[PDB]
Design a protein around this ligand. Structure first.
Ligand SMILES: Cc1cc2nc3c(=O)[nH]c(=O)nc-3n(C[C@H](O)[C@H](O)[C@H](O)COP(=O)(O)OP(=O)(O)OC[C@H]3O[C@@H](n4cnc5c(N)ncnc54)[C@H](O)[C@@H]3O)c2cc1C
Ligand SMILES: NC(=O)C1=CN([C@@H]2O[C@H](COP(=O)(O)OP(=O)(O)OC[C@H]3O[C@@H](n4cnc5c(N)ncnc54)[C@H](O)[C@@H]3O)[C@@H](O)[C@H]2O)C=CC1
Length: 272
């Protein structure tokens, strides 16, 4: 028999109870929610995300988040979410709606989950099923290596895929991650990433850039650029899939032009 599935229907909302919150850094936390019983699984293909929804201040608010847990995990789901606080940034006095609602939840409070959703599914052993859009059937891309460019919380879909690969000893796909954040203290999930490197260095290449670097720094500095792509992702002739996820300007100005300069074609690139 197979475990009971939480997300049985993508149009149903499932209220899940918050059970734990763990600090990732000054503004980011892992939020762990209980599934309907301890034996359930979420029901989420690798590559997919969920949506959270709530009535915040009298208006329904819906936002997507990528679980970093998997269908191997019985009884819980983990999200890694950056909180955009009010009364902090001069351009954003109110902060972010959903992320502060989440930050304010008490353990035992519920929030509605729905899913799965997304254009990409990782089918294992280098196989990716990618829809060109939400109005098209998937096509299955088969690769030996995967470049991953993440900015900030854009790490979450990358980590979800990395974890899926590394746990299968017969999955020979090599992941090359280039992870960009504003400062060293903004790096998310660093111990794991470095733990994954320590354990799986033949399948996992790790590199960082930060917008402003500290004095003691052995990685790159600045926005993602041509040189970083050329040095820290597989080269075009090895026909990798290049996955990217981060702020819209990151994608538009740092990733797309520089991917084109290196020679990774559109049709081998995917933005979460
Ligand atoms: C498919 C998908 C999956 C996603 N998965 C994740 C995920 O796994 N983890 C995750 O954390 N996010 C994820 N996001 C983003 C997420 O959906 C929300 O957009 C995010 O949580 C912000 O929503 P909000 O309602 O808090 O902010 P909103 O109220 O919608 O917006 C406020 C915006 O103002 C800016 N802002 C406000 N206050 C500050 C501040 N103090 N400092 C800097 N900027 C500020 C930010 O740009 C912020 O997004 C994902 C996005 C997509 C498209
Ligand atoms: N589609 C998905 O599955 C997911 C999407 N995301 C998105 O990722 C983003 C994460 O935002 P934050 O963590 O707040 O990022 P952030 O604002 O802290 O920026 C992270 C990095 O993005 C790059 N970047 C930012 N502005 C740039 C610019 N003007 N030019 C070039 N590069 C720039 C920089 O390298 C920076 O260090 C959000 O937009 C979020 O919606 C997050 C998780 C998953």
């Amino acid at each position: 028999s197979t475990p009971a599935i939480t997300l049985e229907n993508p149009d149903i909302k499932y209220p899940l109870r918050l059970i734990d919150k763990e600090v990732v850094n000054h503004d980011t936390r892992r939020f762990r929610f209980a599934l309907p019983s301890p034996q359930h699984i979420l029901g989420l293909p690798v590559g997919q995300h969920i949506y959270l929804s709530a009535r915040i201040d009298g208006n329904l608010v819906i936002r997507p988040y990528v679980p970093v847990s998997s269908d191997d995990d019985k009884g819980f789901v983990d999200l890694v979410i950056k909180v955009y606080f009010k009364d902090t940034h001069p351009k954003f006095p109110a902060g972010g709606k959903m992320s502060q609602y989440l930050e304010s939840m008490k353990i035992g409070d519920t929030i509605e989950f729905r899913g799965p959703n997304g254009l990409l599914v990782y089918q294992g052993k280098g196989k990716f099923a990618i829809r060109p859009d939400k109005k098209s059937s998937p096509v299955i891309k088969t690769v030996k290596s995967v470049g991953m460019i993440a900015g900030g919380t854009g790490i979450t879909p990358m980590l979800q895929v990395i974890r899926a690969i590394m746990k299968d000893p017969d999955d020979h796909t090599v992941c090359h991650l280039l992870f960009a954040n504003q400062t060293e203290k903004d790096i998310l999930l660093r111990p794991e990433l470095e733990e994954l490197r320590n354990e799986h260095s033949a399948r996992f290449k790790l590199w960082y850039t930060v917008d402003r670097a500290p004095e003691a720094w052995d990685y790159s500095q600045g926005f993602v650029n041509e040189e970083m792509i050329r040095d820290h992702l597989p080269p075009p002739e090895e026909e990798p899939l290049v996955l990217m996820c981060g702020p819209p300007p990151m994608i538009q100005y740092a990733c797309l032009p520089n991917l084109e300069r290196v020679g990774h074609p559109k049709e081998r690139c995917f933005a979460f």
